[PDB]
Symmetry: C4
Subunit: 206 residues, 4 copies
Amino acid sequence: MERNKLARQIIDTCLEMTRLGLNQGTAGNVSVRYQDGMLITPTGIPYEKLTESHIVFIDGNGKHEEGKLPSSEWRFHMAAYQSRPDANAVVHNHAVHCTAVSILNRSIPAIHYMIAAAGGNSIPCAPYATFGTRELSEHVALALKNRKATLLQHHGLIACEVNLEKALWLAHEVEVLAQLYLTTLAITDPVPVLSDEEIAVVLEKF
Amino acid sequence: MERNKLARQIIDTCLEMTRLGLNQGTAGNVSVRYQDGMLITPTGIPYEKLTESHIVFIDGNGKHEEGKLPSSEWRFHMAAYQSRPDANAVVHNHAVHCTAVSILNRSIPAIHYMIAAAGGNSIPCAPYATFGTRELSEHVALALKNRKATLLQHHGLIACEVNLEKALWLAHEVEVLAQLYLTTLAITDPVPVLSDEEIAVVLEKF
Amino acid sequence: MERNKLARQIIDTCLEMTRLGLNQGTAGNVSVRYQDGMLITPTGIPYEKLTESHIVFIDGNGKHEEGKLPSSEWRFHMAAYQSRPDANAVVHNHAVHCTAVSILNRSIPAIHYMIAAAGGNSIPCAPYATFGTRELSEHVALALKNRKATLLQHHGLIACEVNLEKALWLAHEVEVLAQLYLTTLAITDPVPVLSDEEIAVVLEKF
Amino acid sequence: MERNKLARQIIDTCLEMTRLGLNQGTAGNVSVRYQDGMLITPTGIPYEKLTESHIVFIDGNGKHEEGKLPSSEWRFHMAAYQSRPDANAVVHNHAVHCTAVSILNRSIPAIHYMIAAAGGNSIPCAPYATFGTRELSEHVALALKNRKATLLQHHGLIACEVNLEKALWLAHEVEVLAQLYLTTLAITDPVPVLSDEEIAVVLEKF
Ligand SMILES: [Zn+2]
Ligand SMILES: [Zn+2]
Ligand SMILES: [Zn+2]
Ligand SMILES: [Zn+2]
């Protein structure tokens, strides 16, 4: 659990995210909980030029290391951490299907049993607020209180978990649920869903 | 036909399934008929960390090897084997197009002549039941009686064949038929189909 | 222009076709004009196991080399050759978008100027006939008289050109036109097209 | 900033464009501002056969190097350069989503905040004119006056920036916005957009 090991994983997650196609228009950012704050990807540097030494440390006060610019979207990573004590890694991206559902400003209902992976019977969509602002941070914090992933209106997705591996895995799964919802919605509205009882069983089961 | 050779193929099938994009949200599982039961992928371990020694043997009684956890979805692999004596390999996944059609709870009609590859003029959709349960197992067994592949409502796909190569090939083909059906359905409903006589000829021909 | 060189290109075309994603459900077949007939891919062997020695020679009489099974779809490759004297290579596949348009049984109208690459203001859709039959062969021959590519109802695509490189290139381009047509048709019907005069200029220009 | 270094980047951009899937039906062309004109990809040669020595120099007068054929679409690259003094690289392609929106002849409205990357609250669609003509050149020049990217009706996309890296990045981003617009439009019309004030803030913020 040396900083550099955490720094490598973050980078490995960026590359993998792109591999899975979640990172289009190279807009994602990834962070891990560290000391009294977090380690996050910097702004500007395209993921393939990323070296361990580029990862930026931001403390609990919001002050980042001297001479390094953290991601322009860092404020809501800090909001995720303070909203979910159990969260140790955060993955943000603008995956296409997730983003299309967020433009429609709809939550993703229980169309598949795997919806329970985020903690409940849905993936909410937090209201729009300009990126990098405290108001956007509040919307995210409120959305993550009872869910591990949320869509952001006219923007994209935030998923948090206990480690980068699961966080990435969750982000990917929400993208699949997003694609499933858009594909069926184009055929029929509303889309058939599993009842709350049924999701209650799957949750207990997980 | 040593266990380890069968163990490698299972792994090669998982990797290939992912390559083809059938394994998104890393939820598939694969098994082969072996001795009095089957060899199946374990739960938990992400496919890229899979080694021959991870594959789990489950006997005809449902008892699995000590210290190894089989896939959480193993019960319906055993149901496939007991429902189709001729089946020697089973491929399960949550491919997106197949899953979208299963959410609509529709069977795939004869929109393409290749539909005959599964044994008839359609790919059925078995009713929803919580994963890992005996009730889901019954639904699958009934669906596979006269077909080699079936969709599972709000869930995904199961395809069985004489070996892993053909099983994987069939799974892939159903995913293509699923995509063809969703794409045309968004334009026109119902989608034009080939008559039963016509499918009767193609079957005799295959 | 040794047989083995032509045999390698055919194989390189199969691999490339798959690379581009035109070969899903591994159903394509490729041929080149040779001596008094053609060299074609065999049936059964999955493209990655293909070696030069697997390619089958079929003469003008329809008799193929002893001990080798040509593609099950060879008859319409021979029809293409006799219908278009200028054709030296034939590419057949079941690309998804092309196939979806063929299920709707519609020709692709002039929605993009590149439609002229196939020779006119459209990509026709030849009527359905059981695969491997002489009746299907007639439908194809008639469709290829004034076009270099045609869709086959409830089936797929056939594209022919002066060499494998251009044939593959044309097949790919028709798949793009197919995707463009399905995507816009889901929004508006009919889809806006370029006038015949306009296509007359582009043709003269090509 | 030797010619050969600029020649390599152009080639690296073609390969990367294809990698991202923006170059389907191999129809794109790329140029950089150089001396009194530009360096552009040649016509005919498929990108994988491209060597530095193939890149063609065209002067401000429209005269290209002896014995080398520049891209058939070079005239609008020269129009981009004379319309946007600040433009140093131009990327043109026929990406599928961009092209589908251009067939509908619609501009892409502010459905996502990243729309500001092209300079305003939209991505316009310039009217159709036969490729390679001066009339098409005029349409493009007018469209690029206040935007860095534009769709071309029944044709594709042109994006310009300060260097190849950003130009490619912009082209990619417009393709994502195009896909987001088509996907949501198939569900609801009109698609929800962010207000002009909101885009005014994001622009100031960028
Ligand atoms: Zn963002
Ligand atoms: Zn499952
Ligand atoms: Zn065929
Ligand atoms: Zn063009």
